Amino acid sequence: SMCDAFVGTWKLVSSENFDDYMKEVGVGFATRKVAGMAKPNMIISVNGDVITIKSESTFKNTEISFILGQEFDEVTADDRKVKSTITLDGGVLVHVQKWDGKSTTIKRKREDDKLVVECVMKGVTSTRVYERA
Numbered sequence: 001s002m003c004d005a006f007v008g009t010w011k012l013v014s015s016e017n018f019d020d021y022m023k024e025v026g027v028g029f030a031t032r033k034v035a036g037m038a039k040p041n042m043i044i045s046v047n048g049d050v051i052t053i054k055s056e057s058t059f060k061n062t063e064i065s066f067i068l069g070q071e072f073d074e075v076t077a078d079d080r081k082v083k084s085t086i087t088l089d090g091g092v093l094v095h096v097q098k099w100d101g102k103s104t105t106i107k108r109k110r111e112d113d114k115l116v117v118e119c120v121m122k123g124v125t126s127t128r129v130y131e132r133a
């Protein structure tokens with residue numbers, strides 16, 4: 001399917017304005033500095049209708065499994081317990097995280113041989129680029 005373009009192993013190669021985006025999300029100082037340093041590997045896989053996104057770094061190891069359009073519980077190292085929904089909108093994986101009446105969007109798009117990640121929170125944008133690993 002269309003998810004196959006996202007499937008594979010990805011390595012973080014560039015990050016821009018991630019600290020200012022995490023500040024705007026409400027991420028604490030210690031967690032921002034820890035997350036800001038990490039150069040994660042990201043494994044995106046598909047099994048039936050279930051999408052798995054595994055991240056691996058010196059900071060942590062995370063795993064989320066989900067069905068497109070089906071809301072799920074996601075864990076974060078901040079004062080936020082989030083309800084997330086991931087949908088596929090015209091080739092773009094749109095990840096909406098909602099907590100305490102607020103929301104942030106993480107968009108992933110395929111550009112050349114890269115996975116371009118756009119994170120938006122109340123006008124503050126961070127761009128992160130991954131390459132195939």
Ligand SMILES: O=C(O)c1ccccc1-c1c2ccc(=O)cc-2oc2cc(O)ccc12
Nearest residue numbers: 035038040053055057062064106117119128
């Ligand atoms: O994938 C990202 O780069 C990302 C962008 C905005 C907010 C969080 C992340 C992020 C993750 C988002 C979803 C997920 O399933 C796993 C993530 O893992 C990350 C690991 C990091 O070191 C650092 C960042 C992440």
Ligand SMILES: O=C(O)c1ccccc1-c1c2ccc(=O)cc-2oc2cc(O)ccc12
Nearest residue numbers: 022025027034035059060062064076077078
């Ligand atoms: O919140 C975390 O556990 C975390 C810790 C280290 C590196 C990245 C994250 C991180 C996420 C990790 C996994 C995940 O599924 C979602 C994450 O979302 C984040 C969002 C932030 O604003 C800021 C950070 C994250």
